């Protein structure tokens, strides 16, 4: 919808879907309010044998075991609620579209999980939504939640 945005660090306005358009395996998003929510989406290329890859998350060097036995791409949703904790593999988006989503809405942070073309949304709660800031490493678009059905379309079948 709103055309290609270059990679940047910003606090997205609420009720707007950020639609990430990555090309290469990567840490594609880091989002936190530095209080009770840390979210990171790691893009894993197709046909990846179980192995521990090194990622930089919020200035910290982390080893994360990744695996992708499919021809599709997988977005690893790493999550922690306290800065002192280690990241957990909370959800996964298995995709042939290579698009992912990020939305701030009603005290929660919404992402997509499942497998295309049947990927669905889920959320994580936070006590300070307004202060969650995202470092989008890749090109992205912005779609309002008043057109969320369009963003579901793109997530599952592409732009």
Residue numbers in the entry: 65 to 223
Paper text:
RV is a non-enveloped double-stranded RNA (dsRNA) virus with three concentric capsid layers encapsidating eleven dsRNA segments. The outermost layer contains the glycoprotein VP7 and the protease-sensitive spike protein VP4, which define the classification of RVs into G and P genotypes, respectively. RVs use the VP8* domain of the spike protein VP4 to recognize specific host glycans in a genotype-dependent manner. Our studies show that VP8* of these genotypes engages the type I precursor glycan (Galβ1,3-GlcNAc) at a unique and conserved binding site that is present in all P, P and P HRVs, and the subtle sequence and structural changes lead to an altered glycan configuration at the reducing end in the neonate-specific P RV, that may play a key role in the age-restricted tropism of some P strains.
The structure of the neonate-specific P VP8* has not been determined previously. To examine whether the VP8* structure of P differs from that of other HRV genotypes including P, P, P, and P, and whether it can bind glycans as observed in P and P, we first determined the crystal structure of VP8* of a neonate-specific P HRV strain RV3 at 2.0 Å resolution. Similar to other VP8* structures, the P VP8* has a β-sandwich galectin fold with a distinct cleft between the two twisted β-sheets. The cleft in the P VP8* is noticeably wider compared to that observed in the VP8* of P HRV, but similar to that observed in the VP8* of other HRV genotypes including P, P, and P. Comparative analysis with the glycan bound structures of P and P VP8*s shows how sequence variations in the P VP8* leads to the loss of A-type HBGA binding observed with P VP8* and how interaction with type I glycans in P VP8* is unlikely to be similar to that observed in P VP8*. The sidechain of R101 in P, which makes a strong hydrogen bond interaction through its side chain with A-type HBGA, is substituted by isoleucine in P which cannot make such an interaction; the hydrophobic residue Y188, which is crucial for stabilizing A-type glycan in P VP8*, is replaced by a hydrophilic amino acid D186 in the P VP8*. The residue R187 involved in direct hydrogen bonds with Gal of LNT in P VP8* is replaced by T184 in P VP8*. The residues Y156 and W178, which provide hydrophobic interaction with LNT in P VP8*, are changed to T156 and H177, respectively. The J-K loop that interacts with LNT in P VP8* projects away in the PVP8* structure. These observations indicate that the neonate-specific P VP8* cannot bind LNT at the same site as P VP8* and likely has a distinct site for type I glycan binding.
